[PDB]
Structure formats: structure tokens, C-alpha cells
Amino acid sequence: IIGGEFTTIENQPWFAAIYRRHRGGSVTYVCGGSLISPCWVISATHCFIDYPKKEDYIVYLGRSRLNSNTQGEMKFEVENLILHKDYSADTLAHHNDIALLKIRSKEGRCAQPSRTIQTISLPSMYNDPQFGTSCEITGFGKENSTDYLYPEQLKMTVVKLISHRECQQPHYYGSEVTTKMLCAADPQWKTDSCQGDSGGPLVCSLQGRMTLTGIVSWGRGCALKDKPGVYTRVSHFLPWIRSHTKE
Numbered sequence: 201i202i203g204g205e206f207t208t209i210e211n212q213p214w215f216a217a218i219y220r221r222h223r224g225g226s227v228t229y230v231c232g233g234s235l236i237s238p239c240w241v242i243s244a245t246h247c248f249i250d251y252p253k254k255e256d257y258i259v260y261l262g263r264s265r266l267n268s269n270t271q272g273e274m275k276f277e278v279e280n281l282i283l284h285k286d287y288s289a290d291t292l293a294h295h296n297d298i299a300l301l302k303i304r305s306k307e308g309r310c311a312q313p314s315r316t317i318q319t320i321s322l323p324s325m326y327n328d329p330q331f332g333t334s335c336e337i338t339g340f341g342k343e344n345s346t347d348y349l350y351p352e353q354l355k356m357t358v359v360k361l362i363s364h365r366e367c368q369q370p371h372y373y374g375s376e377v378t379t380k381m382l383c384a385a386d387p388q389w390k391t392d393s394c395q396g397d398s399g400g401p402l403v404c405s406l407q408g409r410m411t412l413t414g415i416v417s418w419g420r421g422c423a424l425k426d427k428p429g430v431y432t433r434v435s436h437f438l439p440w441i442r443s444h445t446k447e
């Protein structure tokens with residue numbers, strides 16, 4: 201997250217921190233996620249497409265810090281890693297960039313809700329806020345494009361939803377942005393998602409409810425004029441999500 205503020209898990213109790221273990225015993229941070237039901241985290245396929253081995257992954261919930269323990273945090277293995285079959289990437293765009301991680305504690309259980317671990321609601325079919333609406337993002341992603349390490353403390357910021365019309369102009373993204381995507385940016389280009397933020401939530405307060413409007417997907421750089429963050433339009437993927445989450 202370029203700009204914005206540091207935060208704690210209690211402010212974003214649905215955010216999942218997803219790591220990869222390596223041969224040798226090192227663990228790295230992969231991407232964020234959102235808890236959508238006690239057994240299911242939802243994230244981005246491009247985070248996992250090169251390494252689809254569910255065994256390699258660790259999911260934390262209730263976690264505020266990158267490399268240390270937070271009180272009340274829970275550790276999960278990935279029982280089922282489900283990638284969208286029509287995923288693909290172009291120069292810039294990722295398409296159908298959505299994934300489900302079915303989770304389980306070492307004792308065989310799904311998430312137990314607490315003050316620091318809660319689910320985030322899904323939107324209804326083709327039901328998004330109007331452009332100009334403020335929404336929040338959360339992540340351990342880079343704080344500046346030049347960094348090579350991620351922040352140790354979770355972050356958030358508030359960005360504004362951008363119309364498809366503005367997003368698909370030539371100097372923005374042309375036809376690279378589709379209807380199954382959503383753009384959001386700072387009007388002054390000062391805050392943004394950035395590498396490492398992928399897979400995490402774009403949350404919009406919709407009709408008196410905290411709603412998973414987006415999943416961090418792609419962009420051209422971070423906080424660049426005329427280059428908004430691009431997010432998966434979760435409201436266009438409910439038959440996909442329901443289909444894989446029923447069993």
C-alpha cells in the first residue's frame with residue numbers, strides 16, 4: 201500500500217495473510233486474502249498459478265504483523281487450492297484473477313470467529329457501488345515501488361471507485377480493462393495498492409454493510425497518474441464462487 205495508514209487486524213478482521221514454505225525451511229509472504237466463510241478464503245489466482253501445490257501454503261487469520269505472532273491469530277493449512285480455469289494474463293491485465301483456498305487448522309477445523317477473525321460479506325449479483333464511492337484496501341504490500349521488502353505492519357488506505365468509461369480511455373488502460381474488472385484510485389494519485397497487495401480485499405460499505413467489492417489484481421506501477429489499481433469484480437463471479445464453495 202503506497203500512502204494510507206498502518207492498521208491492526210481488529211480493523212480488518214477478514215484479512216488473511218498467505219505465505220509459502222520453501223525446501224530448506226524458509227517461509228515467504230505471497231499475497232493477501234479475505235475470509236468469506238469460516239472454511240473459505242478468497243484471493244487471486246495469479247498469486248498461485250506458478251506454484252499450485254496446496255501443500256506449500258500457510259494461511260494466517262487474526263494476524264497484524266508480517267513476521268511475528270499476533271495474539272489471537274490462527275494458523276491454517278490449505279485443504280483445497282482452487283484456481284479459476286479461464287485465468288490468463290496479458291502484458292498488464294489478469295483475467296479471471298480469482299482463487300479459493302479451503303482452510304483447516306492442524307486439528308482439522310475451519311476458522312473460529314473472534315474479535316480479530318470475522319467473515320466479509322459477498323456482494324449481490326452485478327451490484328456495485330457507484331463510481332466516486334470510497335472503499336478501503338488492506339495489505340502487506342510494498343510502501344514504495346523502490347522497496348524490495350514488505351512492511352512489517354499491516355496497512356490500509358481509502359481509494360475511489362473509477363468508472364469503466366474513465367478507466368478505458370487510451371491514456372488509462374484502453375480496452376485492457378473489461379466488465380469483469382473494477383478500477384479504483386486516489387484522485388491525487390497519492391495512495392494505491394502495490395506489489396504484495398494482490399489477492400487482498402477492496403471493501404466497500406454497501407447498503408449498510410461491509411462488502412467484498414474487489415480483490416487486488418493488477419496495475420501499471422503503483423500510484424502513477426492515470427494508472428488506477430485494477431481489481432477483480434467479485435459481483436461478476438458469484439456462480440463461480442458458489443459452485444466451488446458448496447462442497
Ligand SMILES: CCOc1c(Cl)cc(N2CCCCC2)cc1NC(=O)c1cc(C)c(OCCN)c(C)c1
Nearest residue numbers: 230246247393394395398417418419421422428429
Ligand atoms: C503481471 C504480473 O502479475 C503477477 C504475477 Cl503473474 C505473479 C506474481 N507473483 C509471483 C510470485 C508469488 C506471488 C505472485 C505477481 C504479479 N504481479 C505483481 O507483482 C504486481 C501486482 C500488483 C497488484 C501491482 O500493483 C498494481 C496495483 N496498482 C504491481 C505493481 C505488481
